[PDB]
Amino acid sequence: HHLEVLFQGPAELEHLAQNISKSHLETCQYLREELQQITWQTFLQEEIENYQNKQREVMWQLCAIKITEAIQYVVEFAKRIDGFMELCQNDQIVLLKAGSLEVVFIRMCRAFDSQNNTVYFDGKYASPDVFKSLGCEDFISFVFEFGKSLCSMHLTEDEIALFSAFVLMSADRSWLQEKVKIEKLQQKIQLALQHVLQKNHREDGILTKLICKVSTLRALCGRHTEKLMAFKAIYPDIVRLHFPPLYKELF
Ligand SMILES: CC(C)CCC[C@@H](C)[C@H]1CC[C@H]2[C@@H]3CC=C4C[C@@H](O)CC[C@]4(C)[C@H]3CC[C@]12C
């Protein structure tokens, strides 16, 4: 009893860390190790040429399909975050609309080869050149730069899990009803994230460097929306008839 009391604090942090870490583990398609083992499998020059030969709307539709697949996993992750299912549906939707793609871009660092500037896409590791047909060179550059930036931190799976849960449970999203409840949940997550970070590298104070990225994510995801809207303006029927419904619902 007395021992249990002496441990209650750190125990709680560890319990929350382990819970989120498990949820992350169980909602990623591949193990970190599996992705790392195949970074050499880049697209062949002919394959790259084939993607570049695709028409803008074709490449867009493909990217939307693949993003949506990743988002599905993120939705499963969200469902497992304690507190998330207790929120009103309105807030669950607001949080997912804003944060699902943020988590996708965080998860990207696991499937990103920083040394070679490539990302796991459609079966193999893709350089920026693979995405030329989108007509979004600056955005693609931004994505890969973010990949490199986040990779530079050498985040563990648990760190990614907790950081993902942190940006998802953001109390400052527009239009939230239960801001105070969400804020309290995020605070608890931040403490567990800090707990997990200084367990590996008390060499620095990277928590702030991590939270610094929070702003970049928002900008990156903001750009994605802006571009999707411009694309939709030009190809309304492609979006209506050929884009994944979940993607349309979210964005
Ligand atoms: C204008 C928009 C649609 C262009 C988006 C193009 C690129 C950046 C998108 C298309 C498909 C996306 C990938 C789809 C699936 C995954 C698997 C997930 O476990 C980590 C992120 C990762 C690897 C995504 C990273 C970003 C990605 C490669």
PDB file of C-alpha atoms and ligand atoms in Angstrom:
ATOM      1  CA  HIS A   1       0.000   0.000   0.000  1.00  0.00           C
ATOM      2  CA  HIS A   2       2.592   2.547   1.136  1.00  0.00           C
ATOM      3  CA  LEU A   3       4.874   1.398  -1.720  1.00  0.00           C
ATOM      4  CA  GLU A   4       2.026   1.827  -4.194  1.00  0.00           C
ATOM      5  CA  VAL A   5       1.598   5.403  -2.971  1.00  0.00           C
ATOM      6  CA  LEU A   6       5.329   6.114  -3.316  1.00  0.00           C
ATOM      7  CA  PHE A   7       5.104   5.048  -6.973  1.00  0.00           C
ATOM      8  CA  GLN A   8       1.698   6.407  -7.999  1.00  0.00           C
ATOM      9  CA  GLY A   9       3.076   9.485  -9.813  1.00  0.00           C
ATOM     10  CA  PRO A  10       5.719   7.969 -12.102  1.00  0.00           C
ATOM     11  CA  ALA A  11       3.544   4.860 -12.383  1.00  0.00           C
ATOM     12  CA  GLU A  12       0.805   7.004 -13.907  1.00  0.00           C
ATOM     13  CA  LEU A  13       3.218   8.570 -16.403  1.00  0.00           C
ATOM     14  CA  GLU A  14       4.579   5.174 -17.351  1.00  0.00           C
ATOM     15  CA  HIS A  15       1.089   3.673 -17.588  1.00  0.00           C
ATOM     16  CA  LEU A  16      -0.015   6.442 -19.971  1.00  0.00           C
ATOM     17  CA  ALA A  17       3.200   6.112 -21.971  1.00  0.00           C
ATOM     18  CA  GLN A  18       2.789   2.337 -22.289  1.00  0.00           C
ATOM     19  CA  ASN A  19      -0.864   2.651 -23.282  1.00  0.00           C
ATOM     20  CA  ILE A  20      -0.258   5.143 -26.074  1.00  0.00           C
ATOM     21  CA  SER A  21       2.873   3.272 -27.175  1.00  0.00           C
ATOM     22  CA  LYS A  22       0.826   0.074 -27.553  1.00  0.00           C
ATOM     23  CA  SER A  23      -1.916   1.853 -29.412  1.00  0.00           C
ATOM     24  CA  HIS A  24       0.657   3.218 -31.842  1.00  0.00           C
ATOM     25  CA  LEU A  25       2.286  -0.194 -32.263  1.00  0.00           C
ATOM     26  CA  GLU A  26      -1.077  -1.776 -33.025  1.00  0.00           C
ATOM     27  CA  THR A  27      -2.168   0.890 -35.524  1.00  0.00           C
ATOM     28  CA  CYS A  28       0.894   1.140 -37.793  1.00  0.00           C
ATOM     29  CA  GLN A  29       0.899  -1.123 -40.857  1.00  0.00           C
ATOM     30  CA  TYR A  30       4.615  -1.946 -40.554  1.00  0.00           C
ATOM     31  CA  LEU A  31       7.256  -2.195 -37.869  1.00  0.00           C
ATOM     32  CA  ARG A  32       9.934   0.477 -37.814  1.00  0.00           C
ATOM     33  CA  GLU A  33      12.529  -2.227 -38.432  1.00  0.00           C
ATOM     34  CA  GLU A  34      10.614  -3.581 -41.475  1.00  0.00           C
ATOM     35  CA  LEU A  35      10.531  -0.157 -43.126  1.00  0.00           C
ATOM     36  CA  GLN A  36      14.190   0.532 -42.393  1.00  0.00           C
ATOM     37  CA  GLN A  37      15.255  -2.819 -43.862  1.00  0.00           C
ATOM     38  CA  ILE A  38      13.915  -1.904 -47.290  1.00  0.00           C
ATOM     39  CA  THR A  39      15.065   1.717 -47.744  1.00  0.00           C
ATOM     40  CA  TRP A  40      17.292   0.421 -50.556  1.00  0.00           C
ATOM     41  CA  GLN A  41      14.295  -0.605 -52.564  1.00  0.00           C
ATOM     42  CA  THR A  42      13.921   2.664 -54.449  1.00  0.00           C
ATOM     43  CA  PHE A  43      11.936   3.032 -57.641  1.00  0.00           C
ATOM     44  CA  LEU A  44      13.848   2.110 -60.776  1.00  0.00           C
ATOM     45  CA  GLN A  45      14.572   4.921 -63.202  1.00  0.00           C
ATOM     46  CA  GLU A  46      11.877   3.569 -65.585  1.00  0.00           C
ATOM     47  CA  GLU A  47       9.343   3.473 -62.729  1.00  0.00           C
ATOM     48  CA  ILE A  48      10.148   7.075 -61.813  1.00  0.00           C
ATOM     49  CA  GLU A  49       9.643   8.029 -65.456  1.00  0.00           C
ATOM     50  CA  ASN A  50       6.310   6.210 -65.425  1.00  0.00           C
ATOM     51  CA  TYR A  51       5.098   8.308 -62.471  1.00  0.00           C
ATOM     52  CA  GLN A  52       6.317  11.513 -64.125  1.00  0.00           C
ATOM     53  CA  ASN A  53       4.402  10.548 -67.263  1.00  0.00           C
ATOM     54  CA  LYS A  54       1.123  10.330 -65.301  1.00  0.00           C
ATOM     55  CA  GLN A  55      -1.247  13.250 -65.800  1.00  0.00           C
ATOM     56  CA  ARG A  56      -1.622  15.673 -62.907  1.00  0.00           C
ATOM     57  CA  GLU A  57      -5.064  14.428 -61.849  1.00  0.00           C
ATOM     58  CA  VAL A  58      -3.926  10.793 -62.081  1.00  0.00           C
ATOM     59  CA  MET A  59      -0.958  11.377 -59.793  1.00  0.00           C
ATOM     60  CA  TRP A  60      -3.155  13.384 -57.425  1.00  0.00           C
ATOM     61  CA  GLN A  61      -5.747  10.630 -57.223  1.00  0.00           C
ATOM     62  CA  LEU A  62      -3.099   8.049 -56.463  1.00  0.00           C
ATOM     63  CA  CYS A  63      -1.568  10.177 -53.726  1.00  0.00           C
ATOM     64  CA  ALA A  64      -5.018  10.784 -52.259  1.00  0.00           C
ATOM     65  CA  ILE A  65      -5.687   7.029 -52.176  1.00  0.00           C
ATOM     66  CA  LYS A  66      -2.385   6.345 -50.416  1.00  0.00           C
ATOM     67  CA  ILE A  67      -2.835   9.199 -47.902  1.00  0.00           C
ATOM     68  CA  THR A  68      -6.291   7.924 -47.112  1.00  0.00           C
ATOM     69  CA  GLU A  69      -4.951   4.457 -46.375  1.00  0.00           C
ATOM     70  CA  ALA A  70      -2.548   5.982 -43.851  1.00  0.00           C
ATOM     71  CA  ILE A  71      -5.314   8.113 -42.357  1.00  0.00           C
ATOM     72  CA  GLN A  72      -7.453   5.029 -41.721  1.00  0.00           C
ATOM     73  CA  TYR A  73      -4.714   3.750 -39.407  1.00  0.00           C
ATOM     74  CA  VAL A  74      -4.522   7.130 -37.676  1.00  0.00           C
ATOM     75  CA  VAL A  75      -8.278   7.029 -37.067  1.00  0.00           C
ATOM     76  CA  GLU A  76      -7.776   3.645 -35.321  1.00  0.00           C
ATOM     77  CA  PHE A  77      -5.007   5.202 -33.241  1.00  0.00           C
ATOM     78  CA  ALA A  78      -7.241   8.138 -32.229  1.00  0.00           C
ATOM     79  CA  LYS A  79     -10.003   5.762 -31.163  1.00  0.00           C
ATOM     80  CA  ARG A  80      -7.627   4.217 -28.645  1.00  0.00           C
ATOM     81  CA  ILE A  81      -6.480   7.450 -27.049  1.00  0.00           C
ATOM     82  CA  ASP A  82      -8.069   7.607 -23.633  1.00  0.00           C
ATOM     83  CA  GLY A  83     -10.596  10.405 -23.606  1.00  0.00           C
ATOM     84  CA  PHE A  84     -11.082  10.611 -27.370  1.00  0.00           C
ATOM     85  CA  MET A  85     -14.228   8.466 -27.610  1.00  0.00           C
ATOM     86  CA  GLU A  86     -15.706  10.346 -24.606  1.00  0.00           C
ATOM     87  CA  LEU A  87     -15.696  13.613 -26.554  1.00  0.00           C
ATOM     88  CA  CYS A  88     -18.771  14.734 -28.432  1.00  0.00           C
ATOM     89  CA  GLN A  89     -18.797  13.585 -32.062  1.00  0.00           C
ATOM     90  CA  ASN A  90     -18.387  17.208 -33.161  1.00  0.00           C
ATOM     91  CA  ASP A  91     -15.025  17.438 -31.378  1.00  0.00           C
ATOM     92  CA  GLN A  92     -13.871  13.977 -32.459  1.00  0.00           C
ATOM     93  CA  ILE A  93     -14.429  15.130 -36.028  1.00  0.00           C
ATOM     94  CA  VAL A  94     -12.718  18.507 -35.522  1.00  0.00           C
ATOM     95  CA  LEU A  95      -9.671  16.820 -34.000  1.00  0.00           C
ATOM     96  CA  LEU A  96      -9.431  14.250 -36.772  1.00  0.00           C
ATOM     97  CA  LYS A  97     -10.002  16.766 -39.536  1.00  0.00           C
ATOM     98  CA  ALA A  98      -7.163  18.928 -38.231  1.00  0.00           C
ATOM     99  CA  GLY A  99      -4.812  16.312 -36.878  1.00  0.00           C
ATOM    100  CA  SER A 100      -5.139  13.115 -38.897  1.00  0.00           C
ATOM    101  CA  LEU A 101      -2.765  14.381 -41.617  1.00  0.00           C
ATOM    102  CA  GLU A 102      -0.442  15.832 -38.967  1.00  0.00           C
ATOM    103  CA  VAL A 103      -0.041  12.354 -37.524  1.00  0.00           C
ATOM    104  CA  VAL A 104       0.483  10.957 -41.008  1.00  0.00           C
ATOM    105  CA  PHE A 105       3.413  13.360 -41.503  1.00  0.00           C
ATOM    106  CA  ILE A 106       4.854  12.445 -38.102  1.00  0.00           C
ATOM    107  CA  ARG A 107       4.504   8.744 -38.921  1.00  0.00           C
ATOM    108  CA  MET A 108       6.238   9.525 -42.214  1.00  0.00           C
ATOM    109  CA  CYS A 109       9.582   9.840 -40.408  1.00  0.00           C
ATOM    110  CA  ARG A 110       9.432   6.040 -39.874  1.00  0.00           C
ATOM    111  CA  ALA A 111       9.137   5.416 -43.568  1.00  0.00           C
ATOM    112  CA  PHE A 112      11.627   8.082 -44.611  1.00  0.00           C
ATOM    113  CA  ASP A 113      15.252   7.609 -45.613  1.00  0.00           C
ATOM    114  CA  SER A 114      16.899  10.842 -44.547  1.00  0.00           C
ATOM    115  CA  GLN A 115      20.335  10.001 -45.960  1.00  0.00           C
ATOM    116  CA  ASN A 116      18.843   9.582 -49.443  1.00  0.00           C
ATOM    117  CA  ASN A 117      15.808  11.880 -49.268  1.00  0.00           C
ATOM    118  CA  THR A 118      13.221   9.264 -50.083  1.00  0.00           C
ATOM    119  CA  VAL A 119       9.862   8.235 -48.703  1.00  0.00           C
ATOM    120  CA  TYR A 120       8.042   4.861 -48.757  1.00  0.00           C
ATOM    121  CA  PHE A 121       5.259   5.302 -51.331  1.00  0.00           C
ATOM    122  CA  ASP A 122       3.305   2.870 -53.459  1.00  0.00           C
ATOM    123  CA  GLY A 123       5.602  -0.064 -52.574  1.00  0.00           C
ATOM    124  CA  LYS A 124       9.054   1.453 -52.896  1.00  0.00           C
ATOM    125  CA  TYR A 125      11.102   4.410 -51.673  1.00  0.00           C
ATOM    126  CA  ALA A 126      10.375   7.508 -53.727  1.00  0.00           C
ATOM    127  CA  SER A 127      12.519  10.564 -54.303  1.00  0.00           C
ATOM    128  CA  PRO A 128      10.799  13.951 -54.768  1.00  0.00           C
ATOM    129  CA  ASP A 129      11.052  13.382 -58.528  1.00  0.00           C
ATOM    130  CA  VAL A 130       8.340  10.718 -58.289  1.00  0.00           C
ATOM    131  CA  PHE A 131       5.799  13.404 -57.449  1.00  0.00           C
ATOM    132  CA  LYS A 132       6.665  15.845 -60.266  1.00  0.00           C
ATOM    133  CA  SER A 133       3.313  15.345 -62.044  1.00  0.00           C
ATOM    134  CA  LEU A 134       1.393  16.843 -59.108  1.00  0.00           C
ATOM    135  CA  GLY A 135       2.677  20.271 -60.105  1.00  0.00           C
ATOM    136  CA  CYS A 136       3.498  20.995 -56.443  1.00  0.00           C
ATOM    137  CA  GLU A 137       7.292  21.161 -56.317  1.00  0.00           C
ATOM    138  CA  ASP A 138       7.392  23.606 -53.379  1.00  0.00           C
ATOM    139  CA  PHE A 139       4.935  21.548 -51.318  1.00  0.00           C
ATOM    140  CA  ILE A 140       6.795  18.343 -52.054  1.00  0.00           C
ATOM    141  CA  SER A 141      10.067  20.049 -51.096  1.00  0.00           C
ATOM    142  CA  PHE A 142       8.362  21.111 -47.829  1.00  0.00           C
ATOM    143  CA  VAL A 143       7.225  17.549 -47.143  1.00  0.00           C
ATOM    144  CA  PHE A 144      10.678  16.061 -47.668  1.00  0.00           C
ATOM    145  CA  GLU A 145      12.329  18.836 -45.671  1.00  0.00           C
ATOM    146  CA  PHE A 146       9.940  18.048 -42.821  1.00  0.00           C
ATOM    147  CA  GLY A 147      10.837  14.360 -43.189  1.00  0.00           C
ATOM    148  CA  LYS A 148      14.529  15.178 -42.888  1.00  0.00           C
ATOM    149  CA  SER A 149      13.930  17.535 -39.984  1.00  0.00           C
ATOM    150  CA  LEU A 150      11.943  15.026 -37.983  1.00  0.00           C
ATOM    151  CA  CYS A 151      14.396  12.187 -38.890  1.00  0.00           C
ATOM    152  CA  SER A 152      17.265  14.342 -37.624  1.00  0.00           C
ATOM    153  CA  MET A 153      15.825  13.784 -34.132  1.00  0.00           C
ATOM    154  CA  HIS A 154      15.990   9.980 -34.176  1.00  0.00           C
ATOM    155  CA  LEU A 155      12.634   9.555 -32.491  1.00  0.00           C
ATOM    156  CA  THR A 156      11.837   6.187 -30.971  1.00  0.00           C
ATOM    157  CA  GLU A 157       8.540   4.441 -31.663  1.00  0.00           C
ATOM    158  CA  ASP A 158       7.302   5.432 -28.224  1.00  0.00           C
ATOM    159  CA  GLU A 159       8.351   9.037 -28.809  1.00  0.00           C
ATOM    160  CA  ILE A 160       6.450   9.042 -32.091  1.00  0.00           C
ATOM    161  CA  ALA A 161       3.450   7.475 -30.364  1.00  0.00           C
ATOM    162  CA  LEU A 162       3.321  10.133 -27.673  1.00  0.00           C
ATOM    163  CA  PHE A 163       4.036  13.033 -30.030  1.00  0.00           C
ATOM    164  CA  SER A 164       1.284  11.779 -32.350  1.00  0.00           C
ATOM    165  CA  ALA A 165      -1.143  11.643 -29.430  1.00  0.00           C
ATOM    166  CA  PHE A 166      -0.004  15.131 -28.376  1.00  0.00           C
ATOM    167  CA  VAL A 167      -0.792  16.803 -31.739  1.00  0.00           C
ATOM    168  CA  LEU A 168      -4.039  14.935 -32.095  1.00  0.00           C
ATOM    169  CA  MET A 169      -5.371  15.996 -28.714  1.00  0.00           C
ATOM    170  CA  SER A 170      -4.827  19.673 -29.464  1.00  0.00           C
ATOM    171  CA  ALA A 171      -7.122  21.952 -27.468  1.00  0.00           C
ATOM    172  CA  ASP A 172      -6.557  24.943 -29.757  1.00  0.00           C
ATOM    173  CA  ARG A 173      -8.252  23.525 -32.844  1.00  0.00           C
ATOM    174  CA  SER A 174     -10.956  25.837 -34.137  1.00  0.00           C
ATOM    175  CA  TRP A 175     -14.575  25.023 -33.314  1.00  0.00           C
ATOM    176  CA  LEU A 176     -13.939  22.681 -30.387  1.00  0.00           C
ATOM    177  CA  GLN A 177     -16.649  22.494 -27.727  1.00  0.00           C
ATOM    178  CA  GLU A 178     -14.840  20.655 -24.913  1.00  0.00           C
ATOM    179  CA  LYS A 179     -11.600  22.700 -24.966  1.00  0.00           C
ATOM    180  CA  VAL A 180     -10.920  22.350 -21.238  1.00  0.00           C
ATOM    181  CA  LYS A 181     -11.282  18.549 -21.223  1.00  0.00           C
ATOM    182  CA  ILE A 182      -9.033  18.201 -24.292  1.00  0.00           C
ATOM    183  CA  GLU A 183      -6.433  20.544 -22.810  1.00  0.00           C
ATOM    184  CA  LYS A 184      -6.252  18.410 -19.653  1.00  0.00           C
ATOM    185  CA  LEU A 185      -5.784  15.247 -21.716  1.00  0.00           C
ATOM    186  CA  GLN A 186      -3.039  16.905 -23.781  1.00  0.00           C
ATOM    187  CA  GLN A 187      -1.253  18.055 -20.626  1.00  0.00           C
ATOM    188  CA  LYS A 188      -1.142  14.505 -19.340  1.00  0.00           C
ATOM    189  CA  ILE A 189       0.203  13.352 -22.708  1.00  0.00           C
ATOM    190  CA  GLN A 190       2.849  16.080 -22.762  1.00  0.00           C
ATOM    191  CA  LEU A 191       4.071  14.952 -19.344  1.00  0.00           C
ATOM    192  CA  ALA A 192       4.301  11.347 -20.559  1.00  0.00           C
ATOM    193  CA  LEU A 193       6.052  12.491 -23.724  1.00  0.00           C
ATOM    194  CA  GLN A 194       8.552  14.441 -21.642  1.00  0.00           C
ATOM    195  CA  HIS A 195       8.864  11.335 -19.419  1.00  0.00           C
ATOM    196  CA  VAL A 196       9.649   9.179 -22.465  1.00  0.00           C
ATOM    197  CA  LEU A 197      12.083  11.680 -24.060  1.00  0.00           C
ATOM    198  CA  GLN A 198      14.365  12.244 -21.074  1.00  0.00           C
ATOM    199  CA  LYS A 199      14.517   8.483 -20.561  1.00  0.00           C
ATOM    200  CA  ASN A 200      16.663   8.142 -23.657  1.00  0.00           C
ATOM    201  CA  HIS A 201      18.366  11.505 -24.077  1.00  0.00           C
ATOM    202  CA  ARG A 202      18.716  13.742 -21.022  1.00  0.00           C
ATOM    203  CA  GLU A 203      21.558  15.077 -23.193  1.00  0.00           C
ATOM    204  CA  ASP A 204      19.352  17.957 -24.357  1.00  0.00           C
ATOM    205  CA  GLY A 205      15.877  19.475 -23.890  1.00  0.00           C
ATOM    206  CA  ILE A 206      14.391  18.311 -27.197  1.00  0.00           C
ATOM    207  CA  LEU A 207      10.808  18.498 -25.923  1.00  0.00           C
ATOM    208  CA  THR A 208      10.654  22.148 -27.014  1.00  0.00           C
ATOM    209  CA  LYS A 209      12.367  21.307 -30.322  1.00  0.00           C
ATOM    210  CA  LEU A 210       9.687  18.665 -30.840  1.00  0.00           C
ATOM    211  CA  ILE A 211       6.846  21.064 -29.935  1.00  0.00           C
ATOM    212  CA  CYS A 212       8.519  23.584 -32.252  1.00  0.00           C
ATOM    213  CA  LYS A 213       7.640  21.191 -35.093  1.00  0.00           C
ATOM    214  CA  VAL A 214       3.999  21.463 -34.120  1.00  0.00           C
ATOM    215  CA  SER A 215       3.835  24.803 -35.938  1.00  0.00           C
ATOM    216  CA  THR A 216       5.532  23.381 -39.032  1.00  0.00           C
ATOM    217  CA  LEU A 217       3.020  20.559 -39.202  1.00  0.00           C
ATOM    218  CA  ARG A 218       0.177  22.959 -39.184  1.00  0.00           C
ATOM    219  CA  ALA A 219       1.748  24.915 -42.013  1.00  0.00           C
ATOM    220  CA  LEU A 220       2.461  21.769 -43.994  1.00  0.00           C
ATOM    221  CA  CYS A 221      -1.104  20.472 -43.565  1.00  0.00           C
ATOM    222  CA  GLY A 222      -2.483  23.950 -44.235  1.00  0.00           C
ATOM    223  CA  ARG A 223      -0.665  23.971 -47.582  1.00  0.00           C
ATOM    224  CA  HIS A 224      -2.054  20.571 -48.439  1.00  0.00           C
ATOM    225  CA  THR A 225      -5.614  21.944 -47.955  1.00  0.00           C
ATOM    226  CA  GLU A 226      -4.955  25.080 -49.930  1.00  0.00           C
ATOM    227  CA  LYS A 227      -3.600  23.035 -52.824  1.00  0.00           C
ATOM    228  CA  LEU A 228      -6.396  20.468 -52.710  1.00  0.00           C
ATOM    229  CA  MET A 229      -8.890  23.325 -52.990  1.00  0.00           C
ATOM    230  CA  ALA A 230      -7.093  24.731 -56.024  1.00  0.00           C
ATOM    231  CA  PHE A 231      -6.879  21.285 -57.571  1.00  0.00           C
ATOM    232  CA  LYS A 232     -10.591  20.664 -56.876  1.00  0.00           C
ATOM    233  CA  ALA A 233     -11.359  23.932 -58.672  1.00  0.00           C
ATOM    234  CA  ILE A 234      -9.765  22.605 -61.865  1.00  0.00           C
ATOM    235  CA  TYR A 235     -10.828  18.960 -61.612  1.00  0.00           C
ATOM    236  CA  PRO A 236     -14.135  18.967 -59.699  1.00  0.00           C
ATOM    237  CA  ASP A 237     -15.457  15.780 -61.216  1.00  0.00           C
ATOM    238  CA  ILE A 238     -12.204  13.899 -60.632  1.00  0.00           C
ATOM    239  CA  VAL A 239     -12.460  14.761 -56.975  1.00  0.00           C
ATOM    240  CA  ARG A 240     -16.190  14.031 -56.840  1.00  0.00           C
ATOM    241  CA  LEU A 241     -16.048  10.703 -58.643  1.00  0.00           C
ATOM    242  CA  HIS A 242     -12.537   9.362 -58.059  1.00  0.00           C
ATOM    243  CA  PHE A 243     -11.198  10.654 -54.729  1.00  0.00           C
ATOM    244  CA  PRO A 244     -11.716   8.538 -51.595  1.00  0.00           C
ATOM    245  CA  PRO A 245     -14.821   9.630 -49.681  1.00  0.00           C
ATOM    246  CA  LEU A 246     -12.932   9.724 -46.346  1.00  0.00           C
ATOM    247  CA  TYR A 247     -10.358  12.065 -47.907  1.00  0.00           C
ATOM    248  CA  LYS A 248     -13.176  14.313 -49.169  1.00  0.00           C
ATOM    249  CA  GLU A 249     -14.934  14.228 -45.798  1.00  0.00           C
ATOM    250  CA  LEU A 250     -11.776  15.257 -44.000  1.00  0.00           C
ATOM    251  CA  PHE A 251     -10.376  17.883 -46.332  1.00  0.00           C
TER     252      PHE A 251
HETATM  253  C1  LIG B   1      -0.795  17.127 -52.754  1.00  0.00           C
HETATM  254  C2  LIG B   1      -0.618  15.871 -51.871  1.00  0.00           C
HETATM  255  C3  LIG B   1      -1.822  14.919 -52.055  1.00  0.00           C
HETATM  256  C4  LIG B   1       0.668  15.153 -52.321  1.00  0.00           C
HETATM  257  C5  LIG B   1       1.119  14.109 -51.254  1.00  0.00           C
HETATM  258  C6  LIG B   1       2.347  13.346 -51.784  1.00  0.00           C
HETATM  259  C7  LIG B   1       3.135  12.525 -50.741  1.00  0.00           C
HETATM  260  C8  LIG B   1       3.914  13.489 -49.811  1.00  0.00           C
HETATM  261  C9  LIG B   1       2.261  11.577 -49.894  1.00  0.00           C
HETATM  262  C10 LIG B   1       1.406  10.635 -50.798  1.00  0.00           C
HETATM  263  C11 LIG B   1       1.205   9.337 -49.999  1.00  0.00           C
HETATM  264  C12 LIG B   1       1.816   9.657 -48.630  1.00  0.00           C
HETATM  265  C13 LIG B   1       2.285   8.443 -47.838  1.00  0.00           C
HETATM  266  C14 LIG B   1       1.130   7.443 -47.710  1.00  0.00           C
HETATM  267  C15 LIG B   1       1.355   6.482 -46.573  1.00  0.00           C
HETATM  268  C16 LIG B   1       2.303   6.590 -45.640  1.00  0.00           C
HETATM  269  C17 LIG B   1       2.481   5.457 -44.662  1.00  0.00           C
HETATM  270  C18 LIG B   1       2.550   6.012 -43.222  1.00  0.00           C
HETATM  271  O1  LIG B   1       2.790   4.893 -42.365  1.00  0.00           O
HETATM  272  C19 LIG B   1       3.675   7.050 -43.124  1.00  0.00           C
HETATM  273  C20 LIG B   1       3.414   8.225 -44.094  1.00  0.00           C
HETATM  274  C21 LIG B   1       3.282   7.744 -45.565  1.00  0.00           C
HETATM  275  C22 LIG B   1       4.647   7.181 -46.069  1.00  0.00           C
HETATM  276  C23 LIG B   1       2.756   8.913 -46.430  1.00  0.00           C
HETATM  277  C24 LIG B   1       3.773  10.068 -46.556  1.00  0.00           C
HETATM  278  C25 LIG B   1       3.363  11.199 -47.542  1.00  0.00           C
HETATM  279  C26 LIG B   1       2.976  10.609 -48.921  1.00  0.00           C
HETATM  280  C27 LIG B   1       4.201   9.879 -49.552  1.00  0.00           C
END
